[PDB]
């Protein structure tokens, strides 16, 4: 329902640090090891993903349409952070939740996250058109 | 840094940045379709952004993205070439503001806006060391 809330745990692992985002980046390559902006918005689209499973179909999957969120202490590999998912509407094939995550020790940042509704298959046929 | 000057940053989406690929550890991942994820379009346009920065930092500074808001409009397969254009709004002191968008050659996938921070990486790295288990 509207205003419920659902919660997912993490301890954050060596291996999703910045550097591990994009070893591809000699621009990120010796950044210090602390939990990627990209791995944090991945935790909380997943916390949001387990919470809505329930209402697909058989045949359905979802995609994230949208992220809106701050970034506001760094958490280096060892802590546990929680993302606290709570749903603010969900109308059709139309989904959206506040996220909020905390690492133990601070607050690391919070927002919104949407997502949609997708027919998996109609969905890959689409993707195979685009695809070289 | 110029204000209203736009940097644009190219880069060909491989097979290991799909949805999967950014949580291996998430079975609900595992069954996704294989298109570039959120989490690696974020930090791609953090990335763009790191690069339009550089050789405006001292030495020994780098930054932190402390904020985005962007739409994912579409989705990409591997193999298409993602651009991400960063057009800088504003510098006041630490904080730069960036205004983003990226196309994959075929459609626009997401825009919005992204913040950052001058940090000094010592300095950050001795202070994250000590909240460390």
Same mark, same amino acid.
């Given at each position: 329902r509207v205003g419920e809330r659902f919660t997912h745990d993490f301890v954050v692992?060596?291996?999703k640090t910045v550097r591990h985002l994009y070893p591809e980046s000699?621009?990120?390559?010796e950044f210090p090891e602390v939990f990627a902006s990209g791995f944090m %918005?991945?935790?909380m689209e997943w916390a949001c993903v387990r919470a809505?499973?329930?209402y697909l179909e058989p045949g359905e999957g979802s995609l994230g349409t949208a992220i809106c969120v701050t970034h506001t202490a760094a958490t280096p590999p060892?802590?546990? %952070?929680?993302v606290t998912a709570e749903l603010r509407s969900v109308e059709g094939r139309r989904?959206?939740?506040?996220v909020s995550a905390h690492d133990g020790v601070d607050e690391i940042?919070?927002?919104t996250h949407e997502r949609a509704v997708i027919h998996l298959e109609k969905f890959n046929a689409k993707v195979r058109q685009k695809t070289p």
């Open positions: 692992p060596p291996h000699p621009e990120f390559a %918005v991945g935790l809505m499973a329930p060892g802590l546990t %952070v929680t989904l959206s939740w506040r940042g919070s927002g």
